[PDB]
Design a protein around this ligand. Structure first.
Ligand SMILES: Nc1ncnc2c1ncn2[C@@H]1O[C@H](COP(=O)(O)OP(=O)(O)OP(=O)(O)O)[C@@H](O)[C@H]1O
Ligand SMILES: Nc1nc2c(ncn2[C@@H]2O[C@@H]3COP(=O)(O)O[C@H]3[C@H]2O)c(=O)[nH]1
Length: 454
């Protein structure tokens, strides 16, 4: 029972909200009848974090503040302000038996409150709608806090602990903050003179811009850079699980389920980069590094480039075994060159060897041009793994899986990924196939023995 004039005002309000706009008239009338119009004064907690919850809210008037405490002995973090037409309180009805944040009225507020049963019977659910309607405010809030913390650091705040590795143009040291000894990072130190002489000034500029601007759990973070008279310093996330190439060399080859977890980490890093118009171009096992948990991340962005949408790039680059045919033939390429590399990766992880391999680069390129159908697949490759490999390594870039109508979803929805927990991977709750042994924040035992904006 609801007054007719008020029942019609809610119906009109619910139609104005895009989320609920497409519901049938009879549902909108049931919602308009079952809802409760609750008013709140400025300062009132609509929801308290930690409390039990069984109601969903749609703001019909005013604004609210959303905050969240990480630890009890920690500062509540501001996440976001919500206003008229926004909604909240669905997380405790969809997997948490607990409110995950506080919602405080920031002026005179009115919410249309819906019970858990009505939320499921009438609205259905927002498991697919809350992920897309709202962006990750917790990630944004963390990046803002991290950006302030890192902006206030100097080269004098660090101690060198050990060496993670030495590349062709610089050494990666494990560094630690003097004040917070538990907080370690990977510091890449590059000689300025060496960058000029090897003609890598643009490659270093691009690598900093892309890595520093990238915020993904499947991509090694570049927190910031420093610079002095002779060197450039790149403060990165320390991934102490080791390089995937050494783990592969040791085990010989990875089982189907192991390979699947690592390929999914790459699919997530590519879904992220490709949504920003960035091409990676250097996928290979030596560019995948495990953090202390066993989660794989992309680490080298020397060939990566922001190319935008619907346009190709022309530079020859990559590792001979992983380079796509249109790159070999210098005919221009786009993000679909990355999906070709993913097929190569799957094949190398499952067998220990890449599909196309000659004694030198020129022979390898010739073998790549004959295509994936001239390669004898070992019987240990599962039929669904082989099928995805062959759909990724199509000679015609236009036909590659990942580059069709639904983009990266087509890869994610392939038969090989049936029963793979993509949300658990994105949340970090999925158990990795290889658990690394990391004795402390200083354990490097899993590793073997133009500059104005820097
Ligand atoms: N963020 C990181 N955390 C932990 N170890 C890292 C990190 N970044 C790099 N490393 C390690 O340090 C090594 C040093 O290599 P670097 O990044 O200088 O180039 P590279 O991999 O040798 O490539 P190239 O010689 O082709 O330019 C890496 O191979 C890896 O073992
Ligand atoms: N945890 C969380 N909740 C948020 C955020 N932004 C809005 N909210 C809403 O705040 C609500 C608090 O109660 P719930 O945990 O049930 O559901 C939560 C979300 O609907 C956010 O960034 N994180």
């Amino acid at each position: 029972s609801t007054g007719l004039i008020k029942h019609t005002e809610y119906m009109e309000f619910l139609k104005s909200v895009p989320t609920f706009q497409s519901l049938p008239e009879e549902i909108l009338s049931k919602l308009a009848d079952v809802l409760e119009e609750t008013h709140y004064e400025n300062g009132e907690y609509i929801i308290r974090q930690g409390a039990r919850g069984d109601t969903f809210f749609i703001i019909s008037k005013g604004t609210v503040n959303v905050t969240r405490e990480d630890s009890p002995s920690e500062d509540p973090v501001f996440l976001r302000t919500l206003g008229k037409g926004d909604w909240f309180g669905e997380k405790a009805l969809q997997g948490e038996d607990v409110r995950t944040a506080n919602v405080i009225a920031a002026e005179a507020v009115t919410c249309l409150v819906i019970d858990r049963d009505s939320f499921k019977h009438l609205i259905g659910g927002l498991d697919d709608v809350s992920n897309k309607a709202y962006e990750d405010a917790e990630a944004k809030a963390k990046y803002e806090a991290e950006a302030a913390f890192f902006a206030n650091l100097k080269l004098s705040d660090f101690n060198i602990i050990d060496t993670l590795g030495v590349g062709g143009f610089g050494r990666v040291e494990l560094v630690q903050l003097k004040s917070e000894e538990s907080k370690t990072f990977a510091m890449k130190i590059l000689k300025k003179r060496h960058i000029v002489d090897t003609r890598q000034q643009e490659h270093i500029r691009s690598e900093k811009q892309i890595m520093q601007g990238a915020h993904s759990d499947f991509i090694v973070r570049l927190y910031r850079t420093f610079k002095d008279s002779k060197y450039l310093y790149m403060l990165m996330e320390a991934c102490l699980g080791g390089e995937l190439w050494t783990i592969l060399r040791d085990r010989g080859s990875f089982e189907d389920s192991t390979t699947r977890f690592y390929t999914a980490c790459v699919v997530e890093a590519f879904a992220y980069l490709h949504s920003k118009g960035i091409i990676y171009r250097d996928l290979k096992p030596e560019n995948l590094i495990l953090d202390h948990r066993g989660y794989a991340k992309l680490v080298d962005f020397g060939f990566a480039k922001k190319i935008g949408f619907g346009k190709k790039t022309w530079t020859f680059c990559g590792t001979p075994e992983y380079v796509a045919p249109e790159i070999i033939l210098n005919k221009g390429h786009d993000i679909s060159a990355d999906y070709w590399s993913l097929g190569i990766l799957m094949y190398e992880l499952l067998t220990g060897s890449p599909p196309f391999s000659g004694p030198d680069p020129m022979k390898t390129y010739n073998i790549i041009l004959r295509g994936i159908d001239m390669i004898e697949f070992p019987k240990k490759i599962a039929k669904n793994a082989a099928n995805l490999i062959k759909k990724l390594c199509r000679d015609n870039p236009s036909e590659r899986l990942g580059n069709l109508k639904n983009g990266v979803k087509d890869i994610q929805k392939h038969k090989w990924f049936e029963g793979f927990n993509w949300e658990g991977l994105r949340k970090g709750t999925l158990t990795p196939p290889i658990i690394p042994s990391v004795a402390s924040p200083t354990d490097t035992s899993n590793f073997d023995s133009w500059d104005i904006d820097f």
